[PDB]
């Protein structure tokens, strides 16, 4: 028997043309290979609306959403996948990352813990918000690294752990190691960039983001993160240009905002600081075109 309603906690997009298609899962996967995340997410939403028992659909949706700068929706989707397959280690890794971003410390540590101990190769094994949980995660990961040295994902996972406690120096070293081992992994470069940025190294962060974008040119979270690093260095032309790219790509260019509404408000702050009150007035309407044109990304 089919089940249609283990999905009522997810705010599905209303007018989803993928609901009319024959194989939206296949199409979502194709859109991912194209790096069209907003579009990928809509196709996976269709699958989760029709077949909410398909774990792979929730996993793909979750992964796509966090890449499209929507951690809250990522966590909702991923929790479904986690219920339908508690050994899907990609779901646990992703939950750790999105919870770290959301500053859910207990959930992040629990996700790193499940990530490790769900793998048969490792199952034998003052941070104020969750002190002994953090120490146990550190210990597990270090024990794992002595059984499997030079593992990129253990080093990445230590990176996430150390981001949680603001030990950006140790996080950077570990993620640096992980990208040396896997230099075509866009997420790893992004993770290293965010770590450097959060540790007051934006110039180095931007080098990592460029590598991430050269790998995955539709990686909207990297685009956002570049806006952030540029803004942190007061380079507002560069910030503005990347932020406009991010907004456009996040919504899927030609196509329920919220994630978008704070990016627009952030963009307003940039336009204000650069002394452009005409441009500021335009942000209220939340149309990309004026800014795409003003900032050299499109036409005229």
């Amino acid at each position: 028997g089919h089940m249609l309603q283990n999905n009522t906690d997810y705010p599905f997009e209303a007018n989803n043309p993928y609901m009319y298609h024959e194989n939206p899962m296949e199409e979502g996967l194709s859109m991912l290979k194209l790096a069209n995340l907003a579009e990928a997410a809509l196709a996976f939403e269709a699958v989760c609306q029709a077949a909410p028992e398909r774990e792979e659909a929730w996993r793909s949706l979750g992964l796509t959403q966090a890449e499209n700068e929507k951690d809250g929706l990522a966590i909702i989707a991923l929790n479904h996948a986690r219920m339908l397959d508690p050994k899907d280690i990609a779901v646990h890794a992703a939950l750790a990352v999105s919870h770290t971003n959301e500053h859910n410390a207990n959930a992040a540590l629990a996700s790193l813990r499940a990530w490790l101990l769900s793998q048969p190769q490792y199952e034998q094994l003052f941070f104020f918000a969750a002190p002994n949980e953090y120490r146990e995660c550190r210990t597990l990961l270090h024990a794992a690294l002595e059984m499997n040295p030079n593992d990129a994902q253990l080093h990445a996972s230590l990176g996430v752990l150390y981001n949680l406690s603001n030990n950006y120096d140790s996080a950077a070293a570990n993620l640096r190691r992980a990208v040396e081992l896997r230099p075509d992994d866009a997420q790893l470069w992004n993770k290293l960039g965010a770590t450097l940025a959060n540790g007051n190294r934006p110039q180095e962060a931007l080098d990592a983001y460029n590598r991430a974008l050269d790998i995955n040119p539709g990686y909207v979270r990297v685009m956002y993160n570049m806006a952030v690093s540029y803004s942190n260095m007061s380079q507002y032309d560069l910030a503005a240009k990347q932020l406009v790219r991010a907004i456009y790509m996040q919504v899927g260019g030609t196509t329920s905002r919220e994630a978008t509404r704070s990016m627009w408000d952030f963009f307003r702050m940039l336009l204000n600081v650069m002394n452009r009150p005409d441009l500021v007035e335009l942000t209220y309407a939340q149309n990309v075109e004026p800014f795409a044109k003003e900032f050299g990304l499109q036409s005229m």
């Binding site: 951690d71 940025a197 952030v228 942190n232």
Partner: peptide
């Protein structure tokens, strides 16, 4: 400064 995301 503003926060970056993993």
């Amino acid at each position: 400064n503003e926060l970056s995301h993993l």
